[PDB]
Design an enzyme around this catalytic site. Structure first.
Site, mmCIF file in Angstrom:
data_model
loop_
_atom_site.group_PDB
_atom_site.id
_atom_site.type_symbol
_atom_site.label_atom_id
_atom_site.label_comp_id
_atom_site.label_asym_id
_atom_site.label_seq_id
_atom_site.Cartn_x
_atom_site.Cartn_y
_atom_site.Cartn_z
ATOM 1 C CG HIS A 1 -1.290 8.498 5.078
ATOM 2 N ND1 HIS A 1 -2.012 9.391 4.298
ATOM 3 C CD2 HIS A 1 -1.565 7.241 4.667
ATOM 4 C CE1 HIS A 1 -2.682 8.649 3.429
ATOM 5 N NE2 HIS A 1 -2.434 7.344 3.617
ATOM 6 C CG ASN B 1 -24.981 6.921 -21.969
ATOM 7 O OD1 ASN B 1 -23.870 7.179 -22.481
ATOM 8 N ND2 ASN B 1 -25.588 5.760 -22.159
ATOM 9 C CG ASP C 1 -2.103 0.795 1.094
ATOM 10 O OD1 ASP C 1 -1.966 1.991 0.799
ATOM 11 O OD2 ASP C 1 -3.212 0.245 1.263
ATOM 12 C CG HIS D 1 -2.872 8.003 -1.192
ATOM 13 N ND1 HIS D 1 -4.033 7.320 -1.494
ATOM 14 C CD2 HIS D 1 -2.532 7.736 0.094
ATOM 15 C CE1 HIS D 1 -4.349 6.629 -0.407
ATOM 16 N NE2 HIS D 1 -3.473 6.853 0.579
ATOM 17 C CB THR E 1 -6.477 1.790 -0.166
ATOM 18 O OG1 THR E 1 -5.453 2.606 0.375
ATOM 19 C CG2 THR E 1 -6.188 0.313 0.087
ATOM 20 C CG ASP F 1 -1.160 4.297 2.831
ATOM 21 O OD1 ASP F 1 -1.801 4.373 3.898
ATOM 22 O OD2 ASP F 1 -1.404 4.998 1.846
HETATM 23 C C1 LIG Z 1 -9.820 -4.698 -1.298
HETATM 24 N N1 LIG Z 1 -9.101 -5.496 -0.294
HETATM 25 C C2 LIG Z 1 -8.135 -6.370 -0.671
HETATM 26 N N2 LIG Z 1 -7.799 -6.527 -1.918
HETATM 27 C C3 LIG Z 1 -6.782 -7.467 -2.027
HETATM 28 C C4 LIG Z 1 -6.251 -7.799 -3.357
HETATM 29 C C5 LIG Z 1 -6.680 -7.125 -4.499
HETATM 30 C C6 LIG Z 1 -6.191 -7.464 -5.752
HETATM 31 C C7 LIG Z 1 -5.285 -8.490 -5.840
HETATM 32 F F1 LIG Z 1 -4.796 -8.839 -7.061
HETATM 33 C C8 LIG Z 1 -4.843 -9.187 -4.750
HETATM 34 C C9 LIG Z 1 -5.334 -8.836 -3.503
HETATM 35 C C10 LIG Z 1 -6.391 -8.015 -0.848
HETATM 36 S S1 LIG Z 1 -7.302 -7.382 0.461
HETATM 37 C C11 LIG Z 1 -9.481 -5.399 1.052
HETATM 38 C C12 LIG Z 1 -8.783 -4.958 2.161
HETATM 39 C C13 LIG Z 1 -7.429 -4.341 2.309
HETATM 40 C C14 LIG Z 1 -7.471 -2.915 2.877
HETATM 41 C C15 LIG Z 1 -6.541 -2.679 4.047
HETATM 42 N N3 LIG Z 1 -5.922 -1.362 4.000
HETATM 43 C C16 LIG Z 1 -6.505 -0.275 4.512
HETATM 44 O O1 LIG Z 1 -7.462 -0.352 5.284
HETATM 45 C C17 LIG Z 1 -5.978 1.062 4.073
HETATM 46 C C18 LIG Z 1 -4.658 1.208 3.625
HETATM 47 C C19 LIG Z 1 -4.165 2.421 3.197
HETATM 48 C C20 LIG Z 1 -5.022 3.503 3.208
HETATM 49 N N4 LIG Z 1 -4.879 4.839 2.852
HETATM 50 C C21 LIG Z 1 -6.033 5.496 3.067
HETATM 51 O O2 LIG Z 1 -6.305 6.661 2.878
HETATM 52 O O3 LIG Z 1 -6.952 4.591 3.548
HETATM 53 C C22 LIG Z 1 -6.321 3.360 3.638
HETATM 54 C C23 LIG Z 1 -6.814 2.167 4.065
HETATM 55 N N5 LIG Z 1 -9.592 -5.086 3.280
HETATM 56 C C24 LIG Z 1 -10.746 -5.650 2.836
HETATM 57 C C25 LIG Z 1 -11.917 -6.037 3.512
HETATM 58 C C26 LIG Z 1 -12.936 -6.592 2.764
HETATM 59 C C27 LIG Z 1 -12.796 -6.778 1.385
HETATM 60 C C28 LIG Z 1 -13.916 -7.369 0.583
HETATM 61 C C29 LIG Z 1 -14.384 -8.714 1.132
HETATM 62 C C30 LIG Z 1 -15.529 -9.256 0.304
HETATM 63 N N6 LIG Z 1 -15.101 -9.388 -1.089
HETATM 64 S S2 LIG Z 1 -16.019 -10.363 -2.023
HETATM 65 C C31 LIG Z 1 -17.564 -9.558 -2.186
HETATM 66 O O4 LIG Z 1 -15.394 -10.428 -3.305
HETATM 67 O O5 LIG Z 1 -16.220 -11.577 -1.297
HETATM 68 C C32 LIG Z 1 -14.723 -8.102 -1.678
HETATM 69 C C33 LIG Z 1 -13.568 -7.506 -0.902
HETATM 70 N N7 LIG Z 1 -11.691 -6.433 0.718
HETATM 71 N N8 LIG Z 1 -10.704 -5.867 1.504
HETATM 72 CA CA LIG Z 2 -22.494 6.648 -24.134
HETATM 73 ZN ZN LIG Z 3 -3.517 2.457 -0.422
HETATM 74 ZN ZN LIG Z 4 -3.156 5.977 2.449
#
Ligand SMILES: CN(c1nc(-c2ccc(F)cc2)cs1)c1c(CCCNC(=O)c2ccc3[nH]c(=O)oc3c2)nc2ccc(C3CCN(S(C)(=O)=O)CC3)nn12
Ligand SMILES: [Ca+2]
Ligand SMILES: [Zn+2]
Ligand SMILES: [Zn+2]
Ligand SMILES: *[C@@H]1O[C@H](CO)[C@@H](O[C@@H]2O[C@H](CO)[C@@H](O[C@@H]3O[C@H](CO[C@H]4O[C@H](CO[C@H]5O[C@H](CO)[C@@H](O)[C@H](O)[C@@H]5O)[C@@H](O)[C@H](O)[C@@H]4O)[C@@H](O)[C@H](O)[C@@H]3O)[C@H](O)[C@H]2NC(C)=O)[C@H](O)[C@H]1NC(C)=O
Length: 779
Positions: A260, A661, A116, A414, A154, A256
């Protein structure tokens, strides 16, 4: 129930059975012995010389007893510390010419290591700080940077990586969102992120599952430490072939978090980068210990970069609007405004070009640069603020929380336009399917889902990547792109009509080879159109839209700009090849007090006084607001010739776009919402141009042997120039900057026109796809 023999199990249990999986601690509970059995921490994550051959203690997080290999619970560095093996990073790279996998591995596993907030420029730190990452990078396939999606936050970027889709399509349009159909908000804190209603498209883990490929859980409860995640991945990899996943994900919130706090260039950043590198080392040492280090494909990928941002650099809406109590603002490195429970036109006007140094620009979402693809979702508010790099926007001063000293809690952020250099992130591919020690050009993260599918032998779900455009990253390509079939064949009308059969209210008194350098665009939808040849240009004229879909012409380095004789002012000529009934008419423009017209091929660049008449044909005319003509005239009169001089000739393809659209796709007749008054002449929302020349500029554009060089734009067809705060000045002060802001990929134009370009070159189709996905970014 117990977790004995079930820690981090992959297969689904029912509600009544107690959970032992990655997320059982997230807004849920596990079996009572989950912590005791699955979350051991004693003595840390590294073998030391004194632990080698220790009596086994079942409390240890990992083991350095010699039984650990047979038990499958060694620390990742066990064989290094205790059995005289080298760290993976201390081994010189050898090309992985073929996958070196155990029997029963049908394909190389894919491990995605996402970091991140990892700026592309952090790779400058080198082996000094990140030796493991440096080895992956230098020995694998790497790009100088990878472009994130907007907003450069993110969750939008992670889910883009997962789905191959723009945020507007997958639905995660921010880290914070409001959905007016749910009447509910999404945030990172809390449990909404676990609710499936937010997440559209088809992420890789679903694509994998639905096609019988087993996925490791991509998600971990926050309390599970990184080192445990790595050990779990490695342990999953040692499962028998009927249980073992083929794809795995590890995610780090660093660098990340530190970014920050300390900003991207703070001395404090070295430590987190080292810790990320240690984690990579653990994974690679672990793979080597399993002898899977020449078997597995590894992707090291970031979601976005990090910019210097401090709260002294905050614009406040309350310096522009007297009443700010009636608006809801999603603040920060972007702005989204909606009513709190208010007039959008008043708001935009009040936020437009009000202060000389103004560090944001307001937009209706449909007027944002098309390259951002950020409009076609109900979760995207109509009013958007594009914030200048290094700045924030907030509602009022009191919303910013300062320390007693005045200093703020953050020095990095970011989210900015994804053209900004500080927002660019990293990509590295290492393993048997990636090329060896190969540098590839920068690319967009939307393209990766297709690659990850190809690496896993999966058919990708429909996405916004261009399948085949990253074939040059891989040793072996299971997918070979094919050029799409032309749907509508052109007509080639001769002289069919008499001058006297036209009552349009108008008044006046080798083409192929030199003007269409890369073949005729293919029309990929059902329509009726004509190829019209002229001395100086060629066009594909739509009998449905009553104007060209495309106009193509070449301007040599030596071409001369001329001016219009006074008599040719207001000249429009009927085209005897095209029926009166399929032509525009001048009366519509005379009666439409808001609308004028311009030409796709400019009379200015005619090759002779004689040829100049062709440019005044009704079939070369397009509806243009007076305000937009200021932009178009300057582009055609000054810039095209400047580009021809600079690039040793340019081929230009220009035409209209209709996207009422705002879905980034070619409108059908029925979706057109504005016509020239009292006529069936549709009004373009945008005008495009594709400008091509020889990558080797020593060769002229019409005699290019090797790779091509392209720049493109999609200009908004606006009845004003309120977007350009300097537009009261000479066009030399603002038009080119407007054009650069609205830079585009050829691919973007293809989606918006239903045309396929570059169908006849001396270049491989794979290479053409990379050309079409290229985005020239500026500033
Ligand atoms: C979205 N996500 C994750 N994505 C991956 C991923 C994506 C593509 C890939 F090729 C391989 C892996 C892994 S985990 C995700 C996360 C991670 C977020 C943790 N970080 C932060 O909280 C964060 C970090 C930096 C930041 N800067 C800022 O301003 O804010 C920040 C925040 N955590 C979760 C939790 C839940 C989910 C969903 C679960 C359900 N599924 S589903 C419907 O497909 O079963 C969708 C994803 N993703 N998630
Ligand atoms: Ca169009
Ligand atoms: Zn990020
Ligand atoms: Zn961030
Ligand atoms: C980027 O890539 C995406 C994916 O290919 C493109 O979006 C698709 O666009 C096509 C053409 O407009 C859509 O095709 C239609 O599909 C109908 C079947 O219904 C399916 O629709 C659901 C909609 O998808 C989600 O995405 C939108 C995004 O705004 C949300 O608003 C929705 O609420 C959904 O959450 C699918 O999810 C579902 O599978 C349905 O079965 C069919 O009846 C029509 O004839 C037509 O074929 C398609 O629905 C779009 N898919 C997605 C995932 O968005 C998009 O245009 C690309 N963008 C650019 C600029 O190229």
């Amino acid at each position: 129930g117990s977790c004995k023999g079930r820690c981090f199990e992959l297969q689904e249990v029912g509600p009544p059975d107690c959970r032992c999986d990655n997320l059982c601690k997230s807004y849920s509970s596990c079996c009572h012995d989950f912590d005791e059995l699955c979350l051991k921490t004693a003595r840390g994550w590294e073998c030391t010389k004194d632990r080698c051959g220790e009596v086994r203690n079942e409390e240890n997080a990992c083991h350095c007893s010699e039984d650990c290999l047979s038990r499958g619970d060694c620390c990742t560095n066990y064989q290094v510390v205790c059995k005289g093996e080298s760290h993976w990073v201390d081994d010189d790279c050898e090309e992985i010419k073929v996958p070196e996998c155990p029997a029963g591995f049908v394909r190389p596993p894919l491990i995605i290591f996402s970091v991140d907030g990892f700026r592309a420029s952090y790779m400058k730190k080198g082996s000094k700080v990140m030796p493991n990452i440096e080895k992956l990078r230098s020995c694998g396939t790497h790009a100088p940077y990878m472009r994130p999606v907007y907003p450069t936050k993110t969750f939008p970027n992670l889910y883009t990586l997962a789905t191959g889709l723009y945020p507007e399509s997958h639905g995660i349009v921010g880290n914070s969102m409001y959905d007016p159909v749910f009447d509910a908000s999404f945030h990172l804190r809390g449990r909404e992120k676990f609710n499936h209603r937010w997440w559209g498209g088809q992420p890789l883990w679903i694509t994998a599952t639905k096609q019988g490929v087993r996925a490791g859980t991509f998600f971990w409860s926050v309390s599970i430490p990184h080192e445990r995640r790595i050990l779990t991945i490695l342990q999953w990899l040692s499962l028998p072939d009927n249980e073992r996943p083929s794809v795995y994900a590890f995610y780090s919130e660093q660098p990340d978090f530190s970014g920050h706090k300390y900003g991207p260039f703070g001395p404090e950043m070295t430590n987190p980068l080292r810790e990320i590198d240690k984690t990579v080392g653990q994974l690679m040492d672990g793979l080597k210990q399993l002898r899977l280090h020449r078997c597995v494909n590894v992707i090291f990928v970031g979601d976005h970069g990090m910019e210097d941002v401090t709260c002294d650099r905050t614009e406040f809406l309350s310096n522009y609007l007297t009443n700010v109590d009636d608006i809801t603002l999603v603040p920060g490195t972007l702005g989204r405004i909606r009513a709190k429970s208010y007039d959008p036109k008043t708001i935009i006007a009040a936020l437009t070009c009000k202060k000389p140094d103004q560090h944001f620009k307001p937009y209706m979402k449909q007027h944002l640069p098309k390259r951002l693809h950020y409009a076609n979702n109900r979760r995207i508010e109509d009013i958007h603020l594009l914030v200048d790099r290094r700045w924030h926007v907030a509602r009022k001063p009191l919303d910013v929380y300062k320390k007693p000293s005045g200093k703020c809690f953050f020095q990095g952020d970011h989210g900015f336009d994804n053209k900004v250099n500080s927002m660019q992130t990293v990509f590295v591919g290492y393993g048997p399917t990636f090329k060896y020690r190969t540098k590839v050009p920068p690319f967009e993260n939307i393209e990766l889902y297709n690659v990850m599918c190809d690496l896993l032998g999966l058919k990708p779900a429909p996405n916004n990547g261009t399948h085949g455009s990253l074939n040059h990253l891989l040793r072996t390509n299971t997918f070979r792109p094919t050029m799409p079939d032309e749907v509508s064949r052109p007509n080639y009308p001769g002289i069919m009509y008499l001058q006297s059969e036209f009552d349009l209210g108008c008044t006046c008194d080798s083409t192929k080879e030199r003007h269409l350098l890369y073949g005729r665009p293919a029309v990929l939808y059902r329509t009726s159109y004509d190829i019209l040849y002229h001395t100086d240009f060629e066009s594909g004229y739509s009998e449905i839209f009553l104007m060209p879909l495309w106009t193509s012409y070449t301007i040599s380095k030596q071409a001369e700009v001329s001016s219009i004789p006074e008599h040719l002012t207001n000249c429009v000529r009927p085209d005897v090849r095209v029926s009166p009934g399929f032509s525009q008419n001048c009366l519509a423009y005379k009666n439409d007090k808001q609308m004028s017209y311009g030409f796709l091929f400019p009379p200015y660049l005619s090759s002779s006084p004689e040829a100049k008449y062709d440019a005044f044909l009704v079939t070369n005319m397009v509806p243009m607001y007076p305000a937009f003509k200021r932009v178009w005239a300057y582009f055609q009169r000054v810039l095209v010739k400047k580009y021809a001089s600079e690039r040793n000739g340019v081929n230009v393809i220009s035409g209209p776009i209709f996207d009422y659209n705002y879905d980034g796709l070619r409108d059908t007749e029925d979706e057109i919402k504005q016509y020239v008054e009292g006529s069936s002449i549709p009004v373009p929302t945008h005008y495009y141009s594709i400008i091509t020349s020889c990558l080797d500029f020593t060769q002229p554009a019409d005699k290019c042997d090797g790779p091509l060089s392209v720049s493109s734009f999609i200009l908004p067809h606006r009845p004003d120039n309120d977007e350009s705060c300097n537009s009261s000045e000479d066009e030399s002060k603002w038009v080119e900057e407007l054009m650069k802001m609205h830079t585009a990929r050829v691919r973007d134009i293809e989606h918006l026109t239903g045309l396929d370009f570059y169908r006849k070159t001396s270049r491989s189709y794979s290479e053409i796809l990379t050309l079409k996905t290229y985005l020239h970014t500026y500033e």
